[PDB]
């Protein structure tokens, strides 16, 4: 496996629901590679009988510098217009993945909790959800990482 994840730091946590995600990603590339890396963030909500996902954002890195690389991936937040109110204030998941030439080789999953920023709203939640008061707390120190064996070059 030519590219490996050496560290992931969530820079802004907790944050407002509407704040972009800021991931400081450190990875190593052992050999020169022909193609691009794609980093992608996906939202997964489970409030329905089946899952409903939101692809949030993605960026390409290419060509891949050989050595140790550090950069910040700033990913757009979820669209609350697509999320039922009960799921806005529940535990959800985000998946941070990297693919090489379209082939996913690492996935970092996080639990995310969403709660109001004031005790009185937490215990007396308003009829209409107030997204401006929702704070998201990523469980960033317990990442659930999956690796996949891929063809490289």
């Amino acid at each position: 496996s030519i590219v490996s994840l050496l560290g992931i730091k969530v820079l802004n946590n907790p944050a407002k629901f509407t704040d972009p995600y800021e991931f400081e990603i450190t990875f190593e590339c052992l050999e020169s590679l022909k193609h691009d890396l794609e980093w992608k963030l996906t939202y997964v909500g489970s409030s329905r009988s089946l899952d409903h996902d939101q692809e949030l954002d993605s960026i390409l890195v290419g060509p891949v510098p050989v050595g140790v690389n550090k950069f910040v991936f700033s990913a757009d937040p979820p669209s609350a217009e697509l999320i039922p109110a009960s799921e806005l204030v529940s535990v959800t998941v985000i998946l941070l993945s990297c693919s090489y030439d379209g082939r996913e080789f690492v996935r970092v999953g996080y639990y995310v909790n969403n709660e109001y920023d004031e005790e009185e709203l937490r215990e007396n939640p308003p009829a209409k959800v107030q997204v401006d008061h929702i704070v998201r707390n990523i469980l960033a120190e317990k990442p659930r990482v999956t690796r996949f064996n891929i063809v490289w070059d």
Partner: antibody, heavy 117, light 106 residues
Framework: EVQLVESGGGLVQPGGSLRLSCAASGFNVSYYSIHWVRQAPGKGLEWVAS????????SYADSVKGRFTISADTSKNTAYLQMNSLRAEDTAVYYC??????????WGQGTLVTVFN | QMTQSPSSLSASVGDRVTITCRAS??????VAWYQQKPGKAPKLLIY???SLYSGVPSRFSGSRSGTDFTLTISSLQPEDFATYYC?????????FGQGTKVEIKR
């Protein structure tokens, strides 16, 4: 080439202690989560403890919190379960397992912990 | 909590069987299925509720419907008679179901 090999099981009396070792082969423990899961004879699987990559953060089953500690030595590429204040309930085969996302892909053969009076 | 049912079932080669676990939360990423035979370590079958682990035969599948997670074996083969466990990896705790022993009819 991936392997996990548990050691350190043995006979111990209540109130005693044991330190289990999980020797990782084919991968670096610092980049994967590592988990201890136990099985009493003829009974089901019971999760004990988890440690997570990059930060060494930990989780514990309620019935072992304050008693067991999970850790990993990156230099030795080995995970540990320090088992303090052991009780009759703790007798089991203890498996070490590697995290695969939210699941567990590779399991060792287990080491037997036998509490006896 | 992960309530697994049935605790055992008897079936024939070629039978389609389903095993269900009822979770306290509906997050799909959190649920996995394992096989275990006497004297052997558990084996991963399904992860993230519905994804088949590499090398597992296609007759195994998993699905989620709300808080019900289901393992289906489309046609039991001789090597499939074993005990099956579901797992939920939650925010704070991992929970295993009590297991389902799949025994062979004669």
């Amino acid at each position: 080439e991936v392997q996990l090999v548990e050691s350190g099981g043995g006979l111990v009396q209540p109130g005693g202690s044991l330190r289990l070792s999980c020797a990782a082969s084919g991968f670096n423990v610092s980049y994967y989560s590592i988990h201890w899961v136990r099985q009493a004879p003829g009974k089901g699987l019971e999760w004990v403890a988890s440690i997570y990559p990059y930060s060494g953060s930990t989780s514990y089953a309620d019935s072992v919190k304050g008693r067991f500690t999970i850790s990993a030595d990156t230099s030795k590429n080995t995970a540990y379960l320090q088992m303090n204040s052991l009780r009759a309930e703790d007798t089991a085969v203890y498996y070490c397992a590697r995290g695969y996302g939210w699941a567990l892909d590779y399991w060792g053969q287990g080491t037997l912990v036998t509490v006896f009076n | 909590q992960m309530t697994q049912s049935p605790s055992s079932l008897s079936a024939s080669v070629g039978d389609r069987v389903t095993i269900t676990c009822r979770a306290s939360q509906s997050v799909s990423s959190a649920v996995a299925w394992y096989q275990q035979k006497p004297g052997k370590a558990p084996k991963l079958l399904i992860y993230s509720a519905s994804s088949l682990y590499s090398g597992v035969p296609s007759r195994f599948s998993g699905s989620r419907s709300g808080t019900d997670f289901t393992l289906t074996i489309s046609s039991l083969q001789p090597e499939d008679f074993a005990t099956y466990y579901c797992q939920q990896d939650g925010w704070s705790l991992i929970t295993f179901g009590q297991g389902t022993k799949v025994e062979i009819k004669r």
